Design a protein around this motif. Structure first.
Motif, short mmCIF file in Angstrom:
data_model
loop_
_atom_site.label_atom_id
_atom_site.label_comp_id
_atom_site.label_asym_id
_atom_site.label_seq_id
_atom_site.Cartn_x
_atom_site.Cartn_y
_atom_site.Cartn_z
N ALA A 151 0.29 -1.36 -0.07
CA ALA A 151 0.33 0.23 -0.33
C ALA A 151 1.43 1.26 -0.10
N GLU A 194 -2.88 3.29 4.00
CA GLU A 194 -4.12 3.03 4.33
C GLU A 194 -5.22 3.81 5.03
N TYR A 220 -5.42 9.81 -1.27
CA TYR A 220 -4.01 10.06 -1.05
C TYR A 220 -3.91 11.20 -0.33
N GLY A 250 -0.35 4.09 7.80
CA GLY A 250 -0.66 2.48 8.02
C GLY A 250 -0.55 1.83 9.20
#
Ligand SMILES: *[C@@H]1O[C@H](CO)[C@@H](O[C@@H]2O[C@H](CO)[C@@H](O[C@@H]3O[C@H](CO)[C@@H](O)[C@H](O[C@H]4O[C@H](CO)[C@@H](O)[C@H](O)[C@@H]4O)[C@@H]3O)[C@H](O)[C@H]2NC(C)=O)[C@H](O)[C@H]1NC(C)=O
Ligand SMILES: *[C@@H]1O[C@H](CO)[C@@H](O[C@@H]2O[C@H](CO)[C@@H](O[C@@H]3O[C@H](CO)[C@@H](O)[C@H](O[C@H]4O[C@H](CO)[C@@H](O)[C@H](O)[C@@H]4O)[C@@H]3O)[C@H](O)[C@H]2NC(C)=O)[C@H](O)[C@H]1NC(C)=O
Ligand SMILES: *[C@@H]1O[C@H](CO)[C@@H](O[C@@H]2O[C@H](CO)[C@@H](O[C@@H]3O[C@H](CO)[C@@H](O)[C@H](O)[C@@H]3O)[C@H](O)[C@H]2NC(C)=O)[C@H](O)[C@H]1NC(C)=O
Ligand SMILES: *[C@@H]1O[C@H](CO)[C@@H](O[C@@H]2O[C@H](CO)[C@@H](O[C@@H]3O[C@H](CO)[C@@H](O)[C@H](O)[C@@H]3O)[C@H](O)[C@H]2NC(C)=O)[C@H](O)[C@H]1NC(C)=O
Ligand SMILES: *[C@@H]1O[C@H](CO)[C@@H](O[C@@H]2O[C@H](CO)[C@@H](O)[C@H](O)[C@H]2NC(C)=O)[C@H](O)[C@H]1NC(C)=O
Ligand SMILES: *[C@@H]1O[C@H](CO)[C@@H](O[C@@H]2O[C@H](CO)[C@@H](O)[C@H](O)[C@H]2NC(C)=O)[C@H](O)[C@H]1NC(C)=O
Ligand SMILES: *[C@@H]1O[C@H](CO)[C@@H](O[C@@H]2O[C@H](CO)[C@@H](O)[C@H](O)[C@H]2NC(C)=O)[C@H](O)[C@H]1NC(C)=O
Ligand SMILES: *[C@@H]1O[C@H](CO)[C@@H](O[C@@H]2O[C@H](CO)[C@@H](O)[C@H](O)[C@H]2NC(C)=O)[C@H](O)[C@H]1NC(C)=O
Lengths: 331, 332, 331, 332
Positions: free
Chosen positions: D244, D248, D282, D322
């Motif tokens: 990722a 995330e 993002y 993340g």
């Protein structure tokens, strides 16, 4: 019988705290005021300072047909709250009790307000006792506090912040302050009215030379607080509340502006104020701000000029009662 | 099993305090009294003084036809005849005093057991056992219900810190022990003279006893010396003693006046009292006030003369339990 | 699958404690006993000592037509609880885990009892894992204790007295002990059977020379307890319970008295006991008390003589499980 | 008013830990982004690094008739471009890092504000205020609900004390900041090479970027350097990054592939990505992996290429949020 309540803490603690209480009595005629003596049956060590003779200029008004005739003379009073320097500050160590009164007067009558200040040890020795003033009896009642760590304030138990640094709940507490005359040889460190002028003035006043300070007790019990203490947030708060309410914080009928000579031997007027009738509301005692050496004034039926924005003919009150917000914890 | 309660404070504090407790046991026959020995299973350091042999004159009465009294010298052990300095320094020496006094009629005696010792015992001990003859005594050390003071008639009370010169008033128990102590010249130890002055009685001469009382106030205190002039509590205890010379920790039936010879070798009577029957009420032990050298008396069935207004043939009790009012603060 | 439960404390604390658990498995035939190997899938550091070959005298009985024929021979076993000196005592520091078994046997079958001892840190690393013994799988379950300060004992949370001096609640706890062979050159300090004899004998026994001691764990977790520690109240308690229940504390049919030669090379009998049939009840392993150098015995179908009042032909068991009362606080 | 929560531990402990919190604010128009300044009324010692001017290539897309992209060099301030050693030594220097990253579409940006600082702040401060443009941010320091660990998705979790070689598994948040750091010889700082090795990709040459990530685990931890080979957590974070690459923490509508010149003075394209519209998802900031000297990019409305399996025209994000699984103990 009046009631003077003392709120007693659970412990003495750090040693230097005092208890304070006060009560305003019913009106007495003016002619009786010069005879008033505080008597005590209490088991404490009375400081003798306040019961000595103390020279005041008495300043009074009468209707005439601007429409006023004022006059003045020098007289001696006794028992008033003219506390010498260091007496309150060291009372916890000396074990001395201060009992004195201030006067709130119209033209014909005065209400004495009796103040009692003393060591917290009195709470161990004493449940109740009696003071007398003229024909009035005063029941002093020492009562143990509902709280575990603080004081009952507005029906709430409160403990204020204690640390010297900066870091809470906020509670409004009573402050009672006494004017102390204290001179130094050199400089302006004791020029109390100059401190007020910096806080509330536009331009420069020439001659406000009174030298002294206030000593205050916070709530029902505290260590003495010196005004001004420049870097103390509580001093700053007391001074600001003084500047906005110069006769203290809490029907009276206003008649008009009056002037007079204090002392009476002055050739021109040195004081002003507002004549009133009806129920006395504020205290009637103060000092001229203009003289280094204190000129004490008793002005029944006149609210003497205490507005700090004015330059001339103004005064500071002998006692001052108000309220300040304190940061702390409610519990 | 009797119960001797010790009320334990939260802290030791200033180091010189002692705990005290006491219990009155059931009646035992007189013949068994001379055999009574205190035994202890407790983890404390018993002072040995009180378990030694101690000479008493036994003075007894019988109905005649009127009274017949008689007396003789015997040795008792275990009674509360505490030497000078023992109680006063017990906090420092770490010694425990365990002894009994006797309250007797003609045929039976109720021992009262007294236990006095350092406050540290409260750290070492929850419960332990004393024995006296055929009776077992459970000593129970219990933390005080109060924050700082003592439980006095169901109320938590903290007395003033005692000052010479200068809130609430509570009546507290005082327990005192008579100590024989001579000095080589003067009248500073002439205890019965102190009593005589207080009861307004200056003509007496049978008042040569030298000694004093050592007292504990409530369940724990520092020792109080009687008389100490500048201690207000001493003045209070002496008054209370003068008014209730046989104590006040207390049917008893009075029969009449009796006299006797103490010691038994005296050619004339040296002691008087009041013969009684029924339930023993007061202690039956004391000393003659007339002799510098103590003459100890055990007088079962007789309340020996303790009225301080009398000049001759009088006594001081070996132990005294009573009550005095103390100024202080009642908790919450 | 059997279940070996480990009760885990909330903290490690003073560092030197061990956890212990044990389980008795179902019966296996005798012929399979010599093949038994402990396998582990657990994430801990197995001490290798117990899985080495260890010489035992096997002593067995058969009916004959007093009515018994006994015989003996020397064989090597592995995996039995023959723990070397210092291994358990220093396991908390070395981080070694001890896993071994004892045997409780009749003539034809044995129930192994598996013991697992190890550092309290295992409770952080491990929730469950597997041991194998022959054809049996053993689920080790590490379970966190219901208690805050102690251990679950008889359904009650208990903390024993900790101080070295003399001063409470009383709770009965399990003790598990392992026999350790340990010789010294000079004197009688390690003559373990002499300690038993002083406790339970009238007169003097001549020759009980075995040198060693017991190492015990108390409850589900403790520091190791050395037996005998002469001034330790727990040692005294364990020894007394051993003296009255020499095969431990907790249908078997008694047949009669038997004797035999241990080792088998002895010309006369050196051991006695009681032959039985039915369900194995006690462990079947021990050492002769008579020899300084340990003679280890495995006696299936025989309760070997452990009565300490007897002088000759007696034994000490390899492991011992019982209960002692401890003073402390229930919470 | 947004809310930035700081979870305060019960103790300071071993001295080198930092607290971290972060909040994503509402969308602001692009024209206002170049004017954004972090203001603080808080009683802590702000590190001045992040509020300096920092050169970025701005890369943007427009529909054409197909895409038209363009780029130019601008200066941004306040972004999370933290110099080497600043986070690593913040516990010792007593410095607080407050900065933002930007998550943008073509027309609007959502700043994410990050606040990192010494655990002592928890003693000095209950709440205080940050401002960013027209938004106020309430920082609230709150004692942890847990005895020893941290509240992770409504569960109190204490991770293992991290060991190299050798109970419960909880997925915890990790926040990482990209730090540019060169060394004079060798490949020890060639971060993108580390990613390439992990994704089984050895043919690339646009991987000269030198730097590393500095990460904080949960609400407080000591700084974690990525990559540290003998730390199991480093291995976990790198994997999670590889799978990722845009984090995330997270409708967005994909439009198509775009390319551009970074810096704008390049004669050919040096960057690619995917143009999108709709909700920014993002972050829109990163560095080209190809240049030793960092070329920083701000690409509103474009998901810059971060797939590590690609060789050319790729980037590393400036911040990365993340989750990794940690072994430990769930409380009660
Ligand atoms: C200075 O302040 C004092 C005190 O505040 C003040 O003197 C007081 O004035 C009141 C009212 O003016 C007087 O009240 C009287 O009290 C007697 C007591 O029995 C009453 O009987 C009187 O009642 C009659 O008067 C009222 C007039 O309105 C009627 O409503 C009523 O029904 C009755 O007819 C009367 O109220 C009080 O006695 C004095 N107090 C003292 C201490 O002398 C004084 O006025 C103030 N001075 C100035 C110059 O303003
Ligand atoms: C040494 O101890 C072991 C274990 O304690 C012991 O061996 C076991 O004996 C029991 C009963 O003697 C055996 O039980 C059998 O189990 C099978 C399994 O399917 C059953 O089917 C059998 O049931 C029949 O027998 C019973 C006889 O009373 C009847 O009531 C029943 O209805 C059935 O007809 C039977 O119970 C068991 O198998 C063995 N265990 C092992 C491990 O071999 C042994 O006897 C002891 N040795 C000595 C010498 O005492
Ligand atoms: C000295 O004091 C003792 C103890 O107080 C007296 O002994 C007690 O005397 C009472 C009254 O005579 C006895 O009462 C009886 O109790 C029994 C119980 O067994 C009861 O059944 C009878 O009906 C009767 O009420 C009591 O037994 C006795 N107690 C003891 C403990 O011995 C004694 O009388 C006193 N002596 C003198 C001379 O007064
Ligand atoms: C870039 O992202 C921003 C923020 O996500 C987008 O702006 C938002 O766009 C939505 C959808 O077009 C707007 O929805 C509208 O909301 C109003 C509320 O005033 C409502 O009345 C309308 O019916 C409608 O649903 C929203 O206003 C707007 N939000 C903000 C905070 O500006 C923008 O669309 C994105 N740009 C691109 C090019 O995708
Ligand atoms: C305190 O004194 C000052 C100065 O005499 C008063 O200030 C004046 O107030 C009037 C009406 O409020 C204004 O029109 C003037 O411009 C003010 N002059 C200055 C120099 O400030 C003030 O009102 C007095 N406060 C009182 C009576 O409460
Ligand atoms: C204490 O002794 C005195 C002196 O013997 C007693 O005083 C006598 O009391 C009675 C009753 O009040 C009088 O009638 C006598 O005249 C008193 N005599 C003298 C010499 O004072 C007193 O009663 C005794 N106190 C008691 C028994 O409590
Ligand atoms: C342990 O061994 C001793 C000695 O052999 C046994 O003690 C004898 O027991 C019998 C019956 O109880 C008595 O009649 C003897 O007088 C005892 N002898 C001695 C020397 O004490 C004891 O019973 C054995 N304990 C067992 C088998 O449990
Ligand atoms: C990351 O990049 C690699 C390399 O470009 C992508 O790999 C391609 O994936 C598709 C679908 O699986 C295949 O048809 C291609 O043949 C692959 N090419 C190569 C060179 O490996 C991969 O899809 C990308 N990962 C993403 C977008 O998540």
């Amino acid at each position: 019988t009046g009631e003077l309540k003392i709120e007693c803490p659970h412990t003495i603690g750090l040693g230097q705290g005092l208890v304070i209480g006060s009560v305003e009595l019913p009106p007495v005629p003016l002619t009786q005021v010069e005879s008033l003596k505080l008597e005590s049956s209490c088991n404490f060590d009375l400081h003798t300072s306040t019961s000595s003779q103390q020279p005041f200029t008495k300043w009074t008004w009468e209707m005439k047909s601007t429409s006023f005739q004022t006059k003045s003379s020098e007289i001696n009073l006794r028992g008033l709250c003219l506390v010498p320097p260091l007496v309150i500050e060291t009372a916890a160590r000396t074990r001395k009790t201060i009992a004195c009164f201030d006067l709130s007067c119209n033209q014909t009558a005065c209400q004495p307000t009796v103040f009692l200040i003393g060591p917290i040890q009195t709470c161990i020795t004493t449940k109740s006792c009696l003071l007398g003033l003229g024909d009035q009896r005063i029941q002093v009642n020492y009562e143990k506090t509902y709280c575990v760590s603080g004081q009952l304030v507005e029906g709430v138990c409160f403990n204020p912040v204690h640390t010297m640094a900066l870091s809470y709940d906020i509670v409004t507490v009573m402050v009672r302050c006494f004017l102390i005359a204290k001179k130094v040889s050199t400089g302006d460190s004791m020029k109390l009215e100059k401190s007020f002028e910096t806080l509330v003035q536009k331009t420069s006043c020439t001659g406000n030379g009174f030298q002294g300070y206030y000593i205050c007790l916070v709530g029902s019990s505290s260590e003495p607080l010196y005004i001004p203490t420049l870097d103390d947030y509580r001093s700053a708060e007391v001074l600001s509340r003084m500047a906005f309410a110069p006769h203290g914080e809490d029907a009276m009928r206003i008649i008009g502006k009056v002037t007079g000579k204090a002392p009476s031997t002055e050739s021109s007027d040195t004081i002003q104020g507002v004549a009133f009738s009806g129920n006395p509301l504020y205290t009637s005692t103060g000092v001229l701000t203009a003289k280094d050496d204190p000129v004490y004034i008793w002005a029944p039926g006149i609210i003497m000029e205490g507005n700090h924005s004015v330059c001339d003919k103004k005064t500071l009150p002998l006692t001052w009662t108000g309220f300040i917000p304190l940061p702390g914890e409610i519990e």
